[PDB]
């Protein structure tokens, strides 16, 4: 069920992480909001991202989009190096039977949608 199932390919050589100069990510294909019930279901989505990024001590703000059917969750990090480390952990990985992809987002627009993310600076961890 709601389990990680490895990666579709190894991110090296011809599929190398871009390492963009942003700390902001958009994570894709993680769920379908119309197949979730209650309003506690986003916690399992946030924790699943932190469980896959247990090594990463740089995620500071995490936001799950409960309306888009793209199944998006947004994350901001301290530096682009932390954001690249989360990219490597998630991009091309299998979750709940669907293939997760990651896109970099500009920093100005990220704060425009999530103004709360400025103060959020303590690292997040799994339970």
């Amino acid at each position: 069920s709601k389990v990680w199932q490895g990666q579709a390919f190894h991110l090296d050589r011809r599929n190398s992480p871009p390492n963009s100069l942003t700390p902001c990510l958009k994570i894709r294909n993680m769920f379908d909001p119309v197949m979730e019930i209650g309003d506690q279901w986003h916690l399992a989505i946030q924790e699943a991202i932190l469980e896959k990024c247990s090594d990463n001590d740089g995620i500071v703000h995490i936001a799950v989009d409960k309306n888009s059917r793209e199944g998006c969750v947004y994350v901001k990090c301290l530096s682009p190096e932390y954001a690249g480390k989360a990219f490597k952990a998630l991009h091309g990985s299998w979750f709940d039977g669907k293939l997760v992809t990651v896109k970099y987002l500009r920093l100005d627009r990220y704060h425009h949608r999530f103004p709360q993310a400025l103060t959020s600076n303590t690292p997040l961890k799994p339970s």
Binding site: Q5, G6, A8, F9, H10, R14
Partner: protein, 200 residues
Amino acid sequence: EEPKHWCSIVYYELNNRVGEAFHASSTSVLVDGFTDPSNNKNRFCLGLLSNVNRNSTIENTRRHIGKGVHLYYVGGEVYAECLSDSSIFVQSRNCNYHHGFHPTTVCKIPSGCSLKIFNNQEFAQLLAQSVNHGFETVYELTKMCTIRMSFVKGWGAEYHRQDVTSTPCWIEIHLHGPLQWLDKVLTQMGSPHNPISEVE
């Protein structure tokens, strides 16, 4: 416009073609390792097929195909759903073009997972853009209308098996829709302005 069959499939063992070609007659086709010999509906069964060059390595891989792969074509898109207990390995240029992957990338689909391996609109869009780049650019799109895929055993950069012909059980899918649309462009672009000898 829609083709008679939305895809046709051909099964290989290593570098040898095995069995007759399969032609889809519904939006859903199953490629499994069992023995039902009716290859004129939704099921393409590989267990009944003979191959005089089969060896122990190939035979053991066929035993693990199981329920195999579910290929279906709904809403202008093609999906691969891995019903087998072992993984499948798909190479789809159209899928790779979508996600920014390298065109040669092989995607591991673990058991229980599904992957979108083709989108009609993206191909049709790429075709229209390709016309202004010359005949060779459009003729290269022929490569995008085929999807190769192996059972159980991986191939590509990470694996010792570099080419799909090194895997013991694989199939090749031909997407008749795209091939039809590409054909109507290729026939209106003429031919390359190049020479070819009749002796060499």
